[PDB]
Amino acid sequence: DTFSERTLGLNSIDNTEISEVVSLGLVSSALDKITGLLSADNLSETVSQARDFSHTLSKSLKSRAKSLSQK
Amino acid sequence: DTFSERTLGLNSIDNTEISEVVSLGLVSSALDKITGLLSADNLSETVSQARDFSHTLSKSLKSRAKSLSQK
């Protein structure tokens, strides 16, 4: 796991056994952590971590979409 | 529609007729726009807009989760 994958709890999000509602709970949670980062300050490091979170989440949803479309 | 709802194309994302894969396409797209904002600069205004995007998306996925769980 990368830092973002582990921190955002995403290492199973592209498992198709996970229902849509549960998936939406994981995404919501990840987005709220991004919102939180962006609410504190606008330091470069903070902004860069939020960008890693966003990108990691996007990449995982593309992976999930792939797994889902397979079936 | 708010600025973020319209810009991120989210005004139907909590419609249950929209399939999961299509939903994931809308979320991915929204997250990529957040990544893009956070990749340019760390000005307060830029950071605040990205935070609006993130929050708006999260709120819409909670709404979608609600609509889905209803059925």
mmCIF file of N, CA, C and O in Angstrom, chain A residues 18-21 23-25 27-32 34-35 38-39 41-44 47-48 50-51 53-55 57-59 61-62 64-65 68-69, chain B residues 18-21 23-25 27-32 34-35 38-39 41-44 47-48 50-51 53-55 57-59 61-62 64-65 68-69:
data_model
loop_
_atom_site.group_PDB
_atom_site.id
_atom_site.type_symbol
_atom_site.label_atom_id
_atom_site.label_comp_id
_atom_site.label_asym_id
_atom_site.label_seq_id
_atom_site.Cartn_x
_atom_site.Cartn_y
_atom_site.Cartn_z
ATOM 1 N N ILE A 18 -17.701 -5.966 -2.722
ATOM 2 C CA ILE A 18 -18.100 -4.777 -1.985
ATOM 3 C C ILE A 18 -19.268 -4.119 -2.693
ATOM 4 O O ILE A 18 -19.174 -3.820 -3.880
ATOM 5 N N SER A 19 -20.372 -3.910 -1.983
ATOM 6 C CA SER A 19 -21.566 -3.339 -2.596
ATOM 7 C C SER A 19 -21.393 -1.858 -2.899
ATOM 8 O O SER A 19 -20.490 -1.211 -2.374
ATOM 9 N N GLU A 20 -22.271 -1.314 -3.732
ATOM 10 C CA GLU A 20 -22.152 0.085 -4.111
ATOM 11 C C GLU A 20 -22.257 1.006 -2.904
ATOM 12 O O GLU A 20 -21.489 1.949 -2.792
ATOM 13 N N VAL A 21 -23.192 0.729 -1.998
ATOM 14 C CA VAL A 21 -23.392 1.594 -0.834
ATOM 15 C C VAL A 21 -22.143 1.592 0.052
ATOM 16 O O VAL A 21 -21.705 2.637 0.510
ATOM 17 N N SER A 23 -19.102 0.948 -0.969
ATOM 18 C CA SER A 23 -18.137 1.685 -1.776
ATOM 19 C C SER A 23 -18.314 3.192 -1.597
ATOM 20 O O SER A 23 -17.357 3.927 -1.406
ATOM 21 N N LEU A 24 -19.561 3.645 -1.662
ATOM 22 C CA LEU A 24 -19.856 5.071 -1.516
ATOM 23 C C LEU A 24 -19.471 5.572 -0.126
ATOM 24 O O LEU A 24 -19.081 6.714 0.030
ATOM 25 N N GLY A 25 -19.566 4.705 0.874
ATOM 26 C CA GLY A 25 -19.114 5.036 2.214
ATOM 27 C C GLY A 25 -17.613 5.236 2.281
ATOM 28 O O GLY A 25 -17.138 6.098 3.001
ATOM 29 N N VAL A 27 -15.652 6.127 -0.327
ATOM 30 C CA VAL A 27 -15.320 7.311 -1.116
ATOM 31 C C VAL A 27 -15.641 8.582 -0.335
ATOM 32 O O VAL A 27 -14.809 9.483 -0.233
ATOM 33 N N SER A 28 -16.845 8.637 0.223
ATOM 34 C CA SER A 28 -17.275 9.737 1.077
ATOM 35 C C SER A 28 -16.254 10.026 2.176
ATOM 36 O O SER A 28 -15.892 11.168 2.417
ATOM 37 N N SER A 29 -15.820 8.966 2.850
ATOM 38 C CA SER A 29 -14.847 9.068 3.927
ATOM 39 C C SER A 29 -13.529 9.659 3.420
ATOM 40 O O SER A 29 -12.937 10.519 4.065
ATOM 41 N N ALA A 30 -13.082 9.180 2.263
ATOM 42 C CA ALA A 30 -11.853 9.664 1.652
ATOM 43 C C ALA A 30 -11.979 11.133 1.259
ATOM 44 O O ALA A 30 -11.090 11.934 1.549
ATOM 45 N N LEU A 31 -13.094 11.495 0.635
ATOM 46 C CA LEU A 31 -13.332 12.896 0.275
ATOM 47 C C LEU A 31 -13.400 13.830 1.485
ATOM 48 O O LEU A 31 -12.962 14.974 1.420
ATOM 49 N N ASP A 32 -13.971 13.358 2.583
ATOM 50 C CA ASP A 32 -14.046 14.168 3.798
ATOM 51 C C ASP A 32 -12.652 14.453 4.380
ATOM 52 O O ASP A 32 -12.419 15.507 4.967
ATOM 53 N N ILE A 34 -9.969 14.692 2.468
ATOM 54 C CA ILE A 34 -9.472 15.703 1.531
ATOM 55 C C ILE A 34 -10.008 17.094 1.878
ATOM 56 O O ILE A 34 -9.260 18.066 1.905
ATOM 57 N N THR A 35 -11.309 17.181 2.129
ATOM 58 C CA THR A 35 -11.925 18.426 2.582
ATOM 59 C C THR A 35 -11.247 18.948 3.845
ATOM 60 O O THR A 35 -10.967 20.137 3.971
ATOM 61 N N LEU A 38 -7.838 20.438 3.116
ATOM 62 C CA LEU A 38 -7.998 21.717 2.433
ATOM 63 C C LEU A 38 -8.677 22.790 3.280
ATOM 64 O O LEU A 38 -8.830 23.922 2.838
ATOM 65 N N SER A 39 -9.094 22.442 4.487
ATOM 66 C CA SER A 39 -9.802 23.393 5.334
ATOM 67 C C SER A 39 -8.872 24.006 6.357
ATOM 68 O O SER A 39 -9.149 25.072 6.902
ATOM 69 N N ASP A 41 -5.229 24.659 6.038
ATOM 70 C CA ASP A 41 -4.246 25.610 5.538
ATOM 71 C C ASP A 41 -3.947 25.366 4.064
ATOM 72 O O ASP A 41 -4.380 24.358 3.493
ATOM 73 N N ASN A 42 -3.206 26.287 3.453
ATOM 74 C CA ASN A 42 -2.864 26.161 2.043
ATOM 75 C C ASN A 42 -1.365 26.070 1.815
ATOM 76 O O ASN A 42 -0.869 26.459 0.758
ATOM 77 N N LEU A 43 -0.650 25.555 2.811
ATOM 78 C CA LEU A 43 0.751 25.194 2.631
ATOM 79 C C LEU A 43 0.895 24.213 1.493
ATOM 80 O O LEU A 43 0.020 23.378 1.259
ATOM 81 N N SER A 44 2.004 24.327 0.785
ATOM 82 C CA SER A 44 2.282 23.469 -0.338
ATOM 83 C C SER A 44 2.199 21.986 0.051
ATOM 84 O O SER A 44 1.600 21.190 -0.667
ATOM 85 N N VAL A 47 -1.273 20.850 0.514
ATOM 86 C CA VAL A 47 -1.975 20.822 -0.755
ATOM 87 C C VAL A 47 -1.527 19.626 -1.564
ATOM 88 O O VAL A 47 -2.323 18.998 -2.248
ATOM 89 N N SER A 48 -0.245 19.300 -1.464
ATOM 90 C CA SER A 48 0.316 18.175 -2.206
ATOM 91 C C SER A 48 -0.195 16.831 -1.667
ATOM 92 O O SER A 48 -0.355 15.872 -2.421
ATOM 93 N N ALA A 50 -3.188 16.385 -0.202
ATOM 94 C CA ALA A 50 -4.580 16.353 -0.657
ATOM 95 C C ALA A 50 -4.670 15.937 -2.131
ATOM 96 O O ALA A 50 -5.571 15.188 -2.519
ATOM 97 N N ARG A 51 -3.731 16.429 -2.939
ATOM 98 C CA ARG A 51 -3.642 16.040 -4.338
ATOM 99 C C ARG A 51 -3.297 14.553 -4.488
ATOM 100 O O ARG A 51 -3.820 13.883 -5.371
ATOM 101 N N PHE A 53 -4.091 12.254 -2.245
ATOM 102 C CA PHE A 53 -5.341 11.610 -1.847
ATOM 103 C C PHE A 53 -6.340 11.548 -3.015
ATOM 104 O O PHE A 53 -6.900 10.497 -3.315
ATOM 105 N N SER A 54 -6.560 12.688 -3.663
ATOM 106 C CA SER A 54 -7.532 12.804 -4.744
ATOM 107 C C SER A 54 -7.203 11.876 -5.906
ATOM 108 O O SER A 54 -8.054 11.160 -6.411
ATOM 109 N N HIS A 55 -5.944 11.916 -6.319
ATOM 110 C CA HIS A 55 -5.421 11.105 -7.405
ATOM 111 C C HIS A 55 -5.479 9.614 -7.115
ATOM 112 O O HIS A 55 -5.808 8.811 -7.982
ATOM 113 N N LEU A 57 -7.511 8.133 -4.992
ATOM 114 C CA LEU A 57 -8.913 7.769 -4.963
ATOM 115 C C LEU A 57 -9.465 7.608 -6.387
ATOM 116 O O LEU A 57 -10.148 6.632 -6.693
ATOM 117 N N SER A 58 -9.147 8.559 -7.257
ATOM 118 C CA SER A 58 -9.602 8.518 -8.645
ATOM 119 C C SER A 58 -9.105 7.235 -9.330
ATOM 120 O O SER A 58 -9.852 6.526 -9.988
ATOM 121 N N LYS A 59 -7.836 6.934 -9.129
ATOM 122 C CA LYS A 59 -7.199 5.782 -9.734
ATOM 123 C C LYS A 59 -7.855 4.495 -9.225
ATOM 124 O O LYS A 59 -8.001 3.522 -9.973
ATOM 125 N N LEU A 61 -11.019 4.229 -8.178
ATOM 126 C CA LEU A 61 -12.385 4.144 -8.694
ATOM 127 C C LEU A 61 -12.392 3.701 -10.167
ATOM 128 O O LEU A 61 -13.303 3.014 -10.625
ATOM 129 N N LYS A 62 -11.360 4.085 -10.904
ATOM 130 C CA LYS A 62 -11.184 3.605 -12.268
ATOM 131 C C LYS A 62 -10.940 2.100 -12.246
ATOM 132 O O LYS A 62 -11.466 1.363 -13.075
ATOM 133 N N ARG A 64 -11.928 0.071 -9.832
ATOM 134 C CA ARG A 64 -13.190 -0.541 -9.442
ATOM 135 C C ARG A 64 -14.144 -0.623 -10.631
ATOM 136 O O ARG A 64 -14.740 -1.659 -10.878
ATOM 137 N N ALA A 65 -14.278 0.474 -11.372
ATOM 138 C CA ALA A 65 -15.106 0.503 -12.585
ATOM 139 C C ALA A 65 -14.718 -0.587 -13.574
ATOM 140 O O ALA A 65 -15.579 -1.226 -14.178
ATOM 141 N N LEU A 68 -15.818 -3.961 -12.158
ATOM 142 C CA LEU A 68 -17.273 -4.091 -12.202
ATOM 143 C C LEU A 68 -17.772 -4.364 -13.602
ATOM 144 O O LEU A 68 -18.699 -5.148 -13.797
ATOM 145 N N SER A 69 -17.153 -3.713 -14.577
ATOM 146 C CA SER A 69 -17.587 -3.847 -15.957
ATOM 147 C C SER A 69 -17.248 -5.242 -16.488
ATOM 148 O O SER A 69 -17.922 -5.750 -17.377
ATOM 149 N N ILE B 18 -29.055 5.740 -12.800
ATOM 150 C CA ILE B 18 -27.660 5.800 -13.208
ATOM 151 C C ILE B 18 -26.923 4.602 -12.642
ATOM 152 O O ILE B 18 -26.959 4.376 -11.436
ATOM 153 N N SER B 19 -26.271 3.825 -13.502
ATOM 154 C CA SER B 19 -25.585 2.618 -13.056
ATOM 155 C C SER B 19 -24.318 2.942 -12.279
ATOM 156 O O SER B 19 -23.813 4.061 -12.339
ATOM 157 N N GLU B 20 -23.791 1.958 -11.561
ATOM 158 C CA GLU B 20 -22.606 2.195 -10.752
ATOM 159 C C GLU B 20 -21.421 2.628 -11.603
ATOM 160 O O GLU B 20 -20.706 3.544 -11.226
ATOM 161 N N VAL B 21 -21.219 1.985 -12.750
ATOM 162 C CA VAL B 21 -20.073 2.307 -13.603
ATOM 163 C C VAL B 21 -20.174 3.748 -14.110
ATOM 164 O O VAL B 21 -19.196 4.480 -14.100
ATOM 165 N N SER B 23 -21.801 6.166 -12.622
ATOM 166 C CA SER B 23 -21.555 6.947 -11.416
ATOM 167 C C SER B 23 -20.056 7.098 -11.159
ATOM 168 O O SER B 23 -19.565 8.178 -10.871
ATOM 169 N N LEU B 24 -19.331 5.989 -11.266
ATOM 170 C CA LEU B 24 -17.887 6.004 -11.032
ATOM 171 C C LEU B 24 -17.174 6.880 -12.060
ATOM 172 O O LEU B 24 -16.167 7.491 -11.755
ATOM 173 N N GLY B 25 -17.715 6.950 -13.271
ATOM 174 C CA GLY B 25 -17.190 7.844 -14.287
ATOM 175 C C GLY B 25 -17.368 9.303 -13.919
ATOM 176 O O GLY B 25 -16.506 10.118 -14.197
ATOM 177 N N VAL B 27 -17.675 10.486 -10.764
ATOM 178 C CA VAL B 27 -16.846 10.758 -9.592
ATOM 179 C C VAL B 27 -15.383 10.918 -9.997
ATOM 180 O O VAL B 27 -14.727 11.884 -9.608
ATOM 181 N N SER B 28 -14.889 9.974 -10.789
ATOM 182 C CA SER B 28 -13.541 10.026 -11.341
ATOM 183 C C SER B 28 -13.259 11.370 -12.009
ATOM 184 O O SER B 28 -12.224 11.980 -11.789
ATOM 185 N N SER B 29 -14.195 11.800 -12.849
ATOM 186 C CA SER B 29 -14.082 13.060 -13.568
ATOM 187 C C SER B 29 -13.989 14.239 -12.595
ATOM 188 O O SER B 29 -13.176 15.140 -12.777
ATOM 189 N N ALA B 30 -14.835 14.217 -11.570
ATOM 190 C CA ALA B 30 -14.845 15.262 -10.557
ATOM 191 C C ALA B 30 -13.536 15.276 -9.774
ATOM 192 O O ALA B 30 -12.941 16.336 -9.573
ATOM 193 N N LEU B 31 -13.067 14.104 -9.363
ATOM 194 C CA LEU B 31 -11.785 14.013 -8.658
ATOM 195 C C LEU B 31 -10.596 14.483 -9.498
ATOM 196 O O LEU B 31 -9.654 15.071 -8.978
ATOM 197 N N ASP B 32 -10.622 14.207 -10.794
ATOM 198 C CA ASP B 32 -9.546 14.651 -11.679
ATOM 199 C C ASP B 32 -9.491 16.184 -11.782
ATOM 200 O O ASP B 32 -8.420 16.765 -11.939
ATOM 201 N N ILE B 34 -10.419 18.145 -9.291
ATOM 202 C CA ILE B 34 -9.831 18.495 -7.996
ATOM 203 C C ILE B 34 -8.308 18.342 -8.018
ATOM 204 O O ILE B 34 -7.582 19.218 -7.558
ATOM 205 N N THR B 35 -7.835 17.217 -8.541
ATOM 206 C CA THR B 35 -6.402 16.997 -8.724
ATOM 207 C C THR B 35 -5.776 18.110 -9.557
ATOM 208 O O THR B 35 -4.703 18.617 -9.237
ATOM 209 N N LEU B 38 -5.427 21.332 -7.589
ATOM 210 C CA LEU B 38 -4.358 21.192 -6.606
ATOM 211 C C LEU B 38 -2.973 21.004 -7.220
ATOM 212 O O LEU B 38 -1.985 20.921 -6.503
ATOM 213 N N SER B 39 -2.896 20.926 -8.539
ATOM 214 C CA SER B 39 -1.618 20.690 -9.198
ATOM 215 C C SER B 39 -1.030 21.982 -9.720
ATOM 216 O O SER B 39 0.172 22.075 -9.961
ATOM 217 N N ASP B 41 -1.423 25.404 -8.329
ATOM 218 C CA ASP B 41 -0.907 26.333 -7.334
ATOM 219 C C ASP B 41 -1.573 26.115 -5.982
ATOM 220 O O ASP B 41 -2.547 25.360 -5.875
ATOM 221 N N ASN B 42 -1.050 26.780 -4.954
ATOM 222 C CA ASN B 42 -1.602 26.642 -3.613
ATOM 223 C C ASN B 42 -2.124 27.959 -3.062
ATOM 224 O O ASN B 42 -2.146 28.164 -1.849
ATOM 225 N N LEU B 43 -2.542 28.846 -3.961
ATOM 226 C CA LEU B 43 -3.280 30.038 -3.562
ATOM 227 C C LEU B 43 -4.514 29.652 -2.784
ATOM 228 O O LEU B 43 -5.130 28.618 -3.042
ATOM 229 N N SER B 44 -4.863 30.491 -1.825
ATOM 230 C CA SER B 44 -6.013 30.255 -0.989
ATOM 231 C C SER B 44 -7.283 30.042 -1.825
ATOM 232 O O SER B 44 -8.053 29.123 -1.559
ATOM 233 N N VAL B 47 -7.349 26.741 -3.456
ATOM 234 C CA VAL B 47 -7.510 25.688 -2.471
ATOM 235 C C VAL B 47 -8.941 25.650 -1.987
ATOM 236 O O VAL B 47 -9.495 24.586 -1.747
ATOM 237 N N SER B 48 -9.548 26.824 -1.863
ATOM 238 C CA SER B 48 -10.925 26.925 -1.391
ATOM 239 C C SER B 48 -11.919 26.381 -2.426
ATOM 240 O O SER B 48 -12.961 25.833 -2.069
ATOM 241 N N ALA B 50 -11.216 23.957 -4.647
ATOM 242 C CA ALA B 50 -11.005 22.509 -4.581
ATOM 243 C C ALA B 50 -11.733 21.898 -3.378
ATOM 244 O O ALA B 50 -12.300 20.805 -3.473
ATOM 245 N N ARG B 51 -11.710 22.612 -2.252
ATOM 246 C CA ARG B 51 -12.441 22.196 -1.064
ATOM 247 C C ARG B 51 -13.956 22.216 -1.301
ATOM 248 O O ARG B 51 -14.668 21.337 -0.826
ATOM 249 N N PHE B 53 -15.354 21.768 -4.267
ATOM 250 C CA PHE B 53 -15.540 20.609 -5.139
ATOM 251 C C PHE B 53 -15.632 19.304 -4.330
ATOM 252 O O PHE B 53 -16.547 18.506 -4.517
ATOM 253 N N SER B 54 -14.669 19.096 -3.438
ATOM 254 C CA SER B 54 -14.579 17.872 -2.647
ATOM 255 C C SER B 54 -15.817 17.661 -1.786
ATOM 256 O O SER B 54 -16.395 16.585 -1.752
ATOM 257 N N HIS B 55 -16.201 18.718 -1.084
ATOM 258 C CA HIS B 55 -17.359 18.732 -0.207
ATOM 259 C C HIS B 55 -18.669 18.509 -0.948
ATOM 260 O O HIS B 55 -19.549 17.796 -0.481
ATOM 261 N N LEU B 57 -19.015 17.008 -3.856
ATOM 262 C CA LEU B 57 -18.992 15.643 -4.340
ATOM 263 C C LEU B 57 -19.353 14.659 -3.217
ATOM 264 O O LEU B 57 -20.168 13.758 -3.405
ATOM 265 N N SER B 58 -18.758 14.853 -2.046
ATOM 266 C CA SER B 58 -19.023 13.991 -0.895
ATOM 267 C C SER B 58 -20.518 14.024 -0.540
ATOM 268 O O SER B 58 -21.153 13.000 -0.338
ATOM 269 N N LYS B 59 -21.071 15.220 -0.505
ATOM 270 C CA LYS B 59 -22.460 15.430 -0.148
ATOM 271 C C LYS B 59 -23.372 14.752 -1.174
ATOM 272 O O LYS B 59 -24.429 14.216 -0.823
ATOM 273 N N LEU B 61 -22.560 12.069 -2.996
ATOM 274 C CA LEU B 61 -22.419 10.617 -2.885
ATOM 275 C C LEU B 61 -23.194 10.080 -1.670
ATOM 276 O O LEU B 61 -23.717 8.967 -1.685
ATOM 277 N N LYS B 62 -23.279 10.884 -0.620
ATOM 278 C CA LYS B 62 -24.107 10.545 0.528
ATOM 279 C C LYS B 62 -25.572 10.519 0.103
ATOM 280 O O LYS B 62 -26.332 9.644 0.509
ATOM 281 N N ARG B 64 -26.625 9.989 -2.984
ATOM 282 C CA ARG B 64 -26.780 8.824 -3.841
ATOM 283 C C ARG B 64 -26.907 7.550 -3.009
ATOM 284 O O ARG B 64 -27.786 6.737 -3.249
ATOM 285 N N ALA B 65 -26.030 7.386 -2.023
ATOM 286 C CA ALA B 65 -26.091 6.242 -1.103
ATOM 287 C C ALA B 65 -27.452 6.111 -0.436
ATOM 288 O O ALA B 65 -27.980 5.009 -0.289
ATOM 289 N N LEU B 68 -29.980 4.936 -3.048
ATOM 290 C CA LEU B 68 -29.743 3.539 -3.405
ATOM 291 C C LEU B 68 -30.216 2.593 -2.326
ATOM 292 O O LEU B 68 -30.762 1.531 -2.617
ATOM 293 N N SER B 69 -30.004 2.984 -1.077
ATOM 294 C CA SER B 69 -30.359 2.128 0.043
ATOM 295 C C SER B 69 -31.880 2.041 0.183
ATOM 296 O O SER B 69 -32.403 1.048 0.678
#
